[PDB]
Amino acid sequence: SGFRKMAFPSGKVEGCMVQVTCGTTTLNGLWLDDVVYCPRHVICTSEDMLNPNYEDLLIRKSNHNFLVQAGNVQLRVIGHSMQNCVLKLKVDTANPKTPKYKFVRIQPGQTFSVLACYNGSPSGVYQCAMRPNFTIKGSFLNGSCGSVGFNIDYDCVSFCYMHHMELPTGVHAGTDLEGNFYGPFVDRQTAQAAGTDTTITVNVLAWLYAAVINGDRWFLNRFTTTLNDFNLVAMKYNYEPLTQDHVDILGPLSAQTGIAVLDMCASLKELLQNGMNGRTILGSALLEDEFTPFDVVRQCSGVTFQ
Amino acid sequence: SGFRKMAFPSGKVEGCMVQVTCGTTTLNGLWLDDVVYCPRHVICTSEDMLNPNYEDLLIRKSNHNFLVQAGNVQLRVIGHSMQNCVLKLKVDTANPKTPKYKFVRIQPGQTFSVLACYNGSPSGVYQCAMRPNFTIKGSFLNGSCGSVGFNIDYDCVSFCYMHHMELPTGVHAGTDLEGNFYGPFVDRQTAQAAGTDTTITVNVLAWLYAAVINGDRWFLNRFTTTLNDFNLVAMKYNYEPLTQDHVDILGPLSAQTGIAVLDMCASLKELLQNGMNGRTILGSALLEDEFTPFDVVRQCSGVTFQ
Ligand SMILES: *C(=O)NCCCCCC
Ligand SMILES: *C(=O)NCCCCCC
After folding, report:
1. In chain A, what residues touch B154 (CB-CB under 8 Å)?
2. Do A246 and A270 belong to one domain?
3. What CATH number is attached to the domain comprising A46?
4. Engineered SS bond to B8: which of A156, A210, A240, B113, CB 3.0-4.6 Å?
5. Does residue A217 fall inside a structural domain?
6. B253 and B283 share a domain?
7. Pocket residue to mutate for ligand 1, from A25, A163, A165, most atoms within 8 A of Cβ
8. Which ligand is nearest to the Cα of residue A117, counting in written order?
9. In chain A, how many domains are there?
10. Residues A10 and A122 in one domain
11. What is the spatial distance between Cα B143 and Cα B137, in angstroms, rounded to a whole number?
């Protein structure tokens, strides 16, 4: 029993983190086989960051301009290239700790673990779900650029996120490991800001099923609703539309609990209209939307507790 | 910026987790140097669990009754002994991945990371703070016994918790690594239940300082209060008393933010008396008490954002 915001065990990723220094800038890199991946803005001065042409900045560098430190060992840089917003530093040694891995791009509403790192040294691990507006609500301090986000699927690490910057609302923006930004953000100094966000409805429904599996049942009701009438209330409260594919995805949780998806939808409508009246669900006084149906199934493989 | 419930990177602990099987029971063990530590209830049948005499049960076992599997390698058990509620299995191989470590007992109100494991395989990592009533609100399914809780101090792992059982309210009870239970709980089947709990006041104040460091300021006020008058309101809302040592501990956060501890106390009193009026703090609609002052300082080393 119990329900926690749980991250994947981080060891496989810790064994890949290195420190990359160029000039007076230090940030983190990801060392897989004989390549080190990091944000290309490592090659920028502050004046550069104002309006950089990275192809120009990079042609003025050589391999020896990049100091890579893996723990207590300096790695010899033997090639460099740019792929979109990431720099690829070819090094003369393959990382003996490389896990099985893939570079996957995730969708808004999906979750991943973040290994926050400073100076190539891991400092903490937490779960973060990509927001509909393609930002993440992370916890990052100066120096954390290059920290990565990932899921682990069996023994395979799917990297999905590399951290690049903080937007003015305090939320975070970055790229996939192909260097393509999530969202309409750029690695240069502009007035760029997060667009409007919405709540991830399928996740909120998943979390209500988690609550039922864990014995919180006060919000259930006898009512049902139709998909269209539900989505009419969703729109009003800045919730994403629920689709038939979402309903299908919630199938297993519905079956385990014996609560139809559209019945749980009627509970959610009531919660949106009435609030909680001083009660909590799984320790929260707000409706939580950063657990996907898969996250709930993985963590709640336990008894439904009728 | 940002504030997340962050766990310590788990690799150093992942490298110590093994599977311990006795009879038809499998649970997790912790392999440090040439010893494997696990819950002694691994030696119990269900009928045994009803009312066991563990000294009797253990004298009837031999080394070959214990199968230890470290990944794909069976470890040869060459000695066994009991220390309080933990079993110590001496094995013929020292774990080459043993970190620098210590066995520390923590205090109620302190936090730690949990590496939830099944069949010797790590499945997730999350942050859990020992409650005043010596339970933890974890996320554990059958098979998770033997999973450990820990802090990491530089490269040294301080183990503080081994998981043993779930109480009827769905909260979790266990021991330090010396096998001494936290709280008035026993590793046998009884009607045992969690005693009444309270909120960890110093942690709530720490988290309010985190909120200020992160730009949530709506709950601040011009008022102050005295320590005694504050503790008079605390008692009424099931909050622990605040001590002068707690105030001293909050010193650095008070200095960074320029908000006196007793002024922040007046904000907390107002929040307790009035609620939040539909607003949130650091993404929560409840006052959070599972971050210690040290956790806030470690994660918020960042700009105060005046
Ligand atoms: C990373 O450690 N800091 C981010 C500073 C650079 C942002 C400009 C794109
Ligand atoms: C651990 O995996 N399960 C706990 C079952 C035994 C509890 C009796 C003390």
Report:
1. none
2. yes
3. 2.40.10.10
4. B113
5. yes
6. yes
7. A165
8. 1
9. 3
10. yes
11. 17
* Residues of chain A that touch chain B, judged by Cβ-Cβ distance less than 8 Å: 1-12, 14-15, 115-116, 122-126, 128, 137-142, 166, 170-172, 214-215, 280, 283-286, 298-299, 301-302
CB atoms within 10 A of CB B74: 12
Closest CA to B231 of B269, B263, B274, B276: B269
- The one catalytic residue in B38, B85, B128, B145 is B145
Protein residue closest via CA to atom 1 of ligand 2: B145
Relative to beta strand B156-166, strand B100-103 is parallel
A306 part of a folded domain: no
**Same domain membership, residue A188 and residue A76:** no
DSSP string, chain B: ------BPP-HHHHTTEEEEEETTEEEEEEEETTEEEEEGGGG--HHHHHS--HHHHHHT--GGGEEEEETTEEEPEEEEEEETTEEEEEESS--TTPPEEEE-PPPTT-EEEEEEEETTEEEEEEEEE--TTS-B-----TT-TT-EEEEESSSEEEEEEEEEEE-TTS-EEEE-TTSPBSSS--SS-S--------B-HHHHHHHHHHHHHTT--TT--S----HHHHHHHHHHTTBPPP-HHHHHHHHHHHHHHT--HHHHHHHHHHHHHH--TT--BTTBSS------HHHHHHHT-S----
Task: Report in angstroms the alpha-carbon separations of B27 from B23, B38, B59, B147.
Answer: 11, 8, 20, 9
Q: Would you say the C-alpha torsion A199, A201, A202, A204 has a positive or negative sign?
A: positive
Q: Any idea which ligand is nearest the CA of B28? A: 2
Here the tokens at position A35 are 């390549």
What is the resolution of the experimental data for this entry, in Å? 1.6
Name the structure determination technique: X-ray
